[PDB]
């Protein structure tokens, strides 16, 4: 009933093509980068409030089921980056 | 050890602020819009290949555990939109 | 006269940018889904506020015995997932 | 827990502004009318460009035949009026 | 002379846009995580290709008895999740 | 299942281009050197603007005191050379 040609025509008119594997990786990188920046901000909010961010704090946050699986996947990279940022801010010039 | 002031300063230097509730909704809308467009494309790929997209096809795709939970959440809105698009493409002028 | 044709040709260049018909059908469908999702999210948070904890089993019971409309049932899981994210986000911060 | 209730109460204040259901039905209908009007205006100007002069009689003939969809027939006169305004506005 | 100062002031306006130090630390950390994640994803797909099906229990066993490096263990779950998405995406399409 | 293996084999061909580990260590080190060089160049020009003329003797004094980090000391001469080129290039 011309249904196949209609579909073929709609597919050309659709804004974005079907996502490549390369585009799935890029999209997943952006999502990890977004979630990592929120975790970094959460950990620095704790540091600002007077809860010092240490390996032991991260271990206790992990033991306590506080964090989503996506957060638990990124909590160590967030920890590493927070430490780098705290050390960078410490040095003069 | 000036750790709180360091954290307070880093938080001002961070590109994006902590995400509002409004921004969580906007971000969730963009993710639903992205996943809906991919589902619409998958269903139209089926229509192009000669698998007619009907309420019964969607029921069978749902019975068979083929789709992720996020896909199952959007398969009916994708179905509705595919039907609208197929009907819009059918009419002359 | 060909004056009329040139006037029309000039007006066609000056017309505001127009989304294609299919692209506008998608955008319009996204806005409608986003609006209906935000109402459901509000309804579920109203339940939580009043002391009815929003859980997978509450959603199952509301769906059994037809307490939700078919339009609600279409979006109830995305609404549920977003409410859970929001309750977790509020618990931090 | 009382914590869950207060969290929900706080989230309800933080939720983006929501148009009431009736107000949103109007707004949505305005957007759709504006979109369909601008398509019809473009279609009528495409005809003018191709050498079909856009007149009251052309609109009557398009209506008397089922050449237009119901949605188009609803907006064809406002599209006609606007096309005439635009043709008059052009090259004053 | 104040010639030297004005020359410097002019050069400072002409210098390419510079990301702030903290923003560059984030960007650099994202690139490193993205690179290491893509290597792990490749390693896991190589296993799948060779006939070792990539499952939650395989990841658990590789993590127990220290078969993965600490740097691998840091990203193994995000790699796992992405491999699962990619295998599901390839099954459609 | 043989299906899983072929899917993986196909995904491996579709994966974005990956620099080898050694090549990526070089590229990453180049980006970091380029970034830290441009910061030092900016710092030296900020000094020139403020009235501290940038000379070989100033760089020697900055080095002889532990005023610079190890990363800065590694790049201070290339930053100096580039600042001198830029000051000479400006107002030829």
Author numbering:
A (entry chain C), B (entry chain C): 60 to 152
C (entry chain B), E (entry chain B): 59 to 151
D (entry chain A), F (entry chain A): 59 to 150
Publication passage describing the model:
The protein C is a small viral protein encoded in an overlapping frame of the P gene in the subfamily Orthoparamyxovirinae. This protein, expressed by alternative translation initiation, is a virulence factor that regulates viral transcription, replication, and production of defective interfering RNA, interferes with the host-cell innate immunity systems and supports the assembly of viral particles and budding. A previous sequence analysis revealed an architecture common to all Orthoparamyxoviridae C proteins, with a predicted N-terminal disordered moiety and a C-terminal helical moiety. We solved the crystal structure of the C-terminal part of TupV C protein at a resolution of 2.4 Å and found that it is structurally similar to Sendai virus C protein, suggesting that despite undetectable sequence conservation, these proteins are homologous.
The protein CΔ53 crystallized readily with six molecules in the asymmetric unit in the P3221 space group and diffracted at 2.4 Å resolution. The crystal structure was solved with the SAD method by soaking crystals in a platinum derivative solution, and the structure was refined to a resolution of 2.4 Å. Helix F is kinked at Pro127. The C-terminal part of helix C/D (aa 86–99), is packed onto a hairpin formed by helix E (aa 105–114) and helix F (aa 119–141). Helices D, E, and F form a small domain containing a hydrophobic core. Of note, the residues in the C-terminal part of the C/D helix (Y93, Q97, V99, (R/K)100, T101, L102, E108, and G109) that are strictly conserved among Narmoviruses are exposed to the solvent and could thus represent a recognition motif. In the first mode, two molecules of CΔ53 assembled head-to-tail, forming 14 interchain H-bonds, 2 salt bridges, and burying ~3300 Å2 of accessible surface area (PISA Complex formation Significance Score of 1.0). The chaining of asymmetric units leads to a helical assembly and to the formation of tubular structures with external diameters of ~9.0 nm and hexagonal internal cavities of 2.4–3.0 nm width. In conclusion, TupV CΔ53 is essentially monomeric in solution, in contrast with its multimeric state in the crystal.
